[PDB]
Design a protein around this ligand. Sequence first.
Ligand code: PC1
Ligand code: 3PE
Lengths: 98, 114, 318, 172, 345, 70, 83, 105, 115, 96, 51
Amino acid sequence: MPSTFFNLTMAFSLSLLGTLMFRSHLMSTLLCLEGMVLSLFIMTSVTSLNSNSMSSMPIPITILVFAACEAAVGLALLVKVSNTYGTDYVQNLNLLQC
Amino acid sequence: PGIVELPTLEELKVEEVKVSSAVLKAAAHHYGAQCDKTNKEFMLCRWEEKDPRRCLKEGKLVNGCALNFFRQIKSHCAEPFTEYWTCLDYSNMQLFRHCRQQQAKFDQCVLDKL
Amino acid sequence: MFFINILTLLVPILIAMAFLTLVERKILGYMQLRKGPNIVGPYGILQPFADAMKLFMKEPMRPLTTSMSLFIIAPTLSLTLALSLWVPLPMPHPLINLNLGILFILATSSLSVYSILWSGWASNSKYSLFGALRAVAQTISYEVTMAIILLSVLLMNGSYSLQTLITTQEHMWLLLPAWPMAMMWFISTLAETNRAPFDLTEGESELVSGFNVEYAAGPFALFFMAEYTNIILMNALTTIIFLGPLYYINLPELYSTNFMMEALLLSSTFLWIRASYPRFRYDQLMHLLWKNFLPLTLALCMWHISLPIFTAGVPPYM
Amino acid sequence: MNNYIFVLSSLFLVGCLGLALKPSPIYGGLGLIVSGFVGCLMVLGFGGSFLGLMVFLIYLGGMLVVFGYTTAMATEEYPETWGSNWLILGFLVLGVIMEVFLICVLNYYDEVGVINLDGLGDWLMYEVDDVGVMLEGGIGVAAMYSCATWMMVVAGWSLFAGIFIIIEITRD
Amino acid sequence: MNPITLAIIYFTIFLGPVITMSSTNLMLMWVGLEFSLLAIIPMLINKKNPRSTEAATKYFVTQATASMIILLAIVLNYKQLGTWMFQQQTNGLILNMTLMALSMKLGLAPFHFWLPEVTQGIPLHMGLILLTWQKIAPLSILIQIYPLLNSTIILMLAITSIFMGAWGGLNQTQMRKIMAYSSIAHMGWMLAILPYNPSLTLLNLMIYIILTAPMFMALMLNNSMTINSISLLWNKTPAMLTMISLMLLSLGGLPPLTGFLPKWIIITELMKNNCLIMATLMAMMALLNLFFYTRLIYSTSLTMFPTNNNSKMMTHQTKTKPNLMFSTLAIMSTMTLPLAPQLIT
Amino acid sequence: MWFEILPGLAIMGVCLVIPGVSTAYIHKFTNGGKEKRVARVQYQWYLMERDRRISGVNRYYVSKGLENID
Amino acid sequence: AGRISAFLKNAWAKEPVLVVSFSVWGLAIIMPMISPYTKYASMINKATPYNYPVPVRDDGNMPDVPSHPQDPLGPSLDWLKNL
Amino acid sequence: PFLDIQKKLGISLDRHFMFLSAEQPYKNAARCHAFEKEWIECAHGIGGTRAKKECKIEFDDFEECLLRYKTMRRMHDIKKQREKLMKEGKYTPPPHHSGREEPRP
Amino acid sequence: MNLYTVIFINILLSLTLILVAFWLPQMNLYSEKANPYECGFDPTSSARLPFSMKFFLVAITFLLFDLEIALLLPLPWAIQTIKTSTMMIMAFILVTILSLGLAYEWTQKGLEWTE
Amino acid sequence: RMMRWNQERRRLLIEDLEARIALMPLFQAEKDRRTLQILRENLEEEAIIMKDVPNWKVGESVFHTTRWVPPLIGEMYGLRTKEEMSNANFGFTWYT
Amino acid sequence: YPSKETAHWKPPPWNDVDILKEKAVTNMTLNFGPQHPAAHGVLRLVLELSG
Ligand SMILES: CCCCCCCCCCCCCCCCCC(=O)OC[C@H](COP(=O)([O-])OCC[N+](C)(C)C)OC(=O)CCCCCCCCCCCCCCCCC
Ligand SMILES: CCCCCCCCCCCCCCCCCC(=O)OC[C@H](COP(=O)(O)OCCN)OC(=O)CCCCCCCCCCCCCCCCC
């Protein structure tokens, strides 16, 4: 269990690095966000199962619901970005600097 | 910190029942009704004193009354109990609903005798 | 002994789906005022074997514009998911007994959809892309409907297992308590299996071959095996869930025979539907599900929430 | 058969590394599907199966809609899988070597005891009620219906408000 | 729009921070933050221009990343102690990640880069709703963990937010970017006083909110976007000028305006806790803040920039200004210094 | 005529009867004339493990009755 | 009402799925509130013994609880037996 | 800040599942129920700095129950010494630890 | 272990079938054979251009409804509760608000495939 | 029919759970005795033969509470065989 | 305060809307060739499609 929790924390760290380092794709950034979400779900589920916290077992379902809501909003914003430009490029959406 | 104290093999030795789960479930209701005082004494000590190391006498009494119950079953009438627990042992869940006839014969045994 | 059990599950299923191809061709022919194959075998029984040998002795013909890794992974994935989906069915004792059997079924079906999508995108062709997008729309609609249907039916049942379904249907079918759920589940199994009326993923008329248009023989045979195995499986799941076979503890052979008869009847019903009806449009399938089945199944899910509460007929946990 | 969960956790780490390394979103969704299946296996190994099957089904639907969107708009003429740049492959194997190096360092430094090579597979499940009915995962998720109705209602309002939110965003 | 979805979206905007500040479970605080973000996004992207789309995208990815780090901290705390609140013996790494992520939610430097970008390209009322209402829930979480915070990281974030906000507001000519950099500076002051007194950061938050509500209202009256647009206010609404100047001076922290009170009492508490270096640097950069406010005052009030011909038609027409909201907040944000012992709590 | 489909139907019928019947018979052969003894819960698994320890041949399906008690 | 009846009949002729769904929704709302068996479901779930009944000490001042399972005292399940 | 509408109105939206030793679904426990109970009963009424100071014994016991670092280190030391003695040939494991034991129910 | 062995056996069976399919027959590969199909003509595009699906709002609604499904799925264990009145009310409210969202989207023409 | 049959199944489940309840104290006593036997043999095998290191206490616990702390699965099967440890970890989970 | 690193900037528009027209949707060209079953054996129906 501590080795697995270390691996899950490192997986979250990798997905956070993916979120922070952009590569030309808002969709790939959203994918990194949902990878962070999946890592947090697995961490919470493993912790609750190990500690037998059946009262706290609704917590992963709650984070999954709110994470899918935020993924829905991100996909809608990506649709609006694609309608604006046609390429979905984070470097292409840059015109608010002035 | 302190040294944890725990009993020895000599005081953990007991005459174990050596009886399968299907025959235990076949005899479960009459065992639960015959000596419920001893079993409830063991459960009361076990839930009051959370330490298992101070209920060993009550556990040995539970084993003793269970052994006496099964010895009475074996002495008085054994073959309808045998066919009843084998019919229970046949199914994958030991469902009482499958073999109510053998259950009725075993109940007739324990009502006529004892 | 367990590997022998795996063989006696897997090999009869593969022979059953090959003869399902034979039965489909003959039933469609006899409904089309013609015959089926009757030359290759004594009564056409060697026709699927001849088809299989021809497909596995033609070249697979890897294309140029093609993501080869996904192009190879997708048909093997489809076949292994079809067999994995066949694993936990009880007749009346499953090979692998799962507590959350229906959840396992749903997960494996969604992964089979992923196999179709990856094949369509990897075979870098426009008709393959069209077939993949149609698969996306189709699985959206039937996934939400199927989840609600199974929720309500297993709320009438106890746990998410299938031996519990056998013990529930010991006295009476589930078709009589929930027949509208059975109708919507039959239509949803058609949509899951990508069968007529709304196949729309291998659409021979709108597209050329859909997602198989670049798959030559070999992996194409793998896709066909997966599809027809899924046909037999969805009919088998429908007769386990709704048309409960007679179960007796002393002998299970009559349970297996009753399950066989009803599964054969529902497979022939699938071929009957294919002979009878024309194709939907894939937006019309989404409109039909999301505007007719989804409100009705939401209401019926609410009704099956309320029913054991006001009748005190809450099923046991085990 | 002791290090099964550790092998699964390493596979999850590799899948998250690929997702971080950011392929074309087709392969990103592939990596997230693989990671979701692996995390489902990890949850199933640690205990109740309902949470693992739930996250598997949810991510299957999510990555399906993601696949549709990256076909629709988030695509290009040559979608890079991993080998368009040798730097991506070199960085993947560099991260793998760094993972092996760090777990070897933490096995050598066994004072804290986060990762132990000899003690792996010994502390997976700590204490379980050997005799007992209704102690698996899913009973608590059911207790969301009766004991955490606030959790249930905030999740339901999130989904309802989300329907309104997505309609108003994509109203155009 | 549509009244039904207007009610749903605005109720969820209200409900987010309310759940966060009234819930004792860290998970429910996180779902309140999620409520606030997801509810406020469609209000941001409403005009459907490229700038609104860009601002909504930037805001979404920033707040989603910060909330994911918050949830990581919550899950790690739950792993370490089994509870759903940082009680007393959590890990300092967990607490520092919480502080960093809540700082990126709040938008103070060096996590401040998105805030003028998002505030620009967004209508003025939505900028008001962002810069006032969105900063209460993360501040509520920060106030809840009032001890067990790293004063070093707190003071570093505070000093760099005040420095960068002063410099950014000094450079900018767009009114919304000016308001965003003012937000960054005042958030720096609140975060500075956070580990020593929750009452003083609450007081500074209230003073800032009642100071920048009527500033945004006065911008909203004439839809004035730039320094020139606010400069031709003597022809449009000449009665606005004295209140505009007094509120800008109060945002600068000049005595005897009541905006001097939060900086004065924060400096007092930091003197009580022996942080004279930080307090002195913060006060000098607040003087820089007052410089760009005073340049704004020179543009709009103390001089008369040239006007155009169509402002005659603007004077011909009639207007409407909200009762009970502008004048009340302007008076309470300018002439309430002698009620300072009542204001401090 | 229409009965020409019955050979293929009968081959499908025997190929669908075979797996369930074979699974039941193999379960009986492996468990010694009884069923699989599925364990949905920890109590049932504990009963199986206790039976395996009681039998002495490390097989849970070897049922021990009243002959073990004198 | 004439207009309400005509509208309902037209809806039943033209869109007989929304009508069925709303009727089933209303029936599922109403039926638990009028059924006489609604309390029985909660009582059955209460009477289902998933846990061990922990015995209490005999201080001699409680006559309500039984002294043995074969006693007239205690919550008998004859309602469920005859249900 | 922290509003207390739940304490003011007397309701409990999210207060019955704040920690492990709190209202498990059927009757279950959370593997450190006694230790967390003792720690909370120690810390209540004196909360903050005093609870950090003079409930350190209870907190250390609860943290040891939950994380099991000392048990892991003790078991690792025992197994390391056992493997060293196996290498040096000075130890033979008993039948019950290694191989066939006498099974009791 | 049993389910793992069956999964691996099915995977190995599929791999064996495709390996037989690839190493058994005779290969004759040239450019016109392996060109993309496109109904007997050269493709104008590269088949990797943007596709512009028309049911994107339905897909996002499917995401939200799938998570509502995930909420609704623990009902078979929820009906075993001791209260059952708050359970029934909560299930009714959840299904009702899901249906209200579907009805609002239908009224606002969300699931109508805007071209 | 479903109402009547589900009520009958509820009665059958109550009967099965009551049989389990009647068999509970015997299983509890045997389980506690087996756990104490495993702990005693682990303590003796650590005591006499294993530890001759000068700075080591044999029966030392890791808690100051001096009450009964139930042992972990890895604590009671740690000195046992790897197959037995794997059975104790993944027996019920893998049995399917 | 324009410098060499920011002298190329422009003030934002008054109404936050600027012309950014591309008209590069590039509708997919697909031919119902003279092999399609829907085509009557001999037809090259070139289709400009928007999905
Ligand atoms: C598995 C068991 C067997 C199942 C049946 C298998 C055999 C029959 C197969 C038939 C052919 C199926 C092939 C595919 C057909 C696809 C088309 C199709 O079916 O479309 C669906 C069609 C759709 O019809 P439609 O699309 O033409 O509708 C027009 C709608 N507009 C105008 C908006 C387009 O029908 C349905 O959706 C109905 C679903 C089933 C409804 C069942 C209701 C039962 C009664 C409920 C209670 C009533 C009383 C109310 C309360 C009273 C209280 C006292
Ligand atoms: C071509 C590549 C294909 C890759 C994808 C393969 C897909 C496989 C089929 C779909 C699987 C979907 C997810 C299913 C997960 C298992 C479902 C489940 O419920 O498992 C739990 C079950 C025991 O749980 P329960 O029923 O509660 O029993 C307790 C008391 N009886 O059982 C268990 O606990 C057993 C746990 C293991 C079961 C899954 C084993 C998978 C093995 C890895 C396969 C892929 C390997 C990588 C690729 C290989 C090379 C191609």
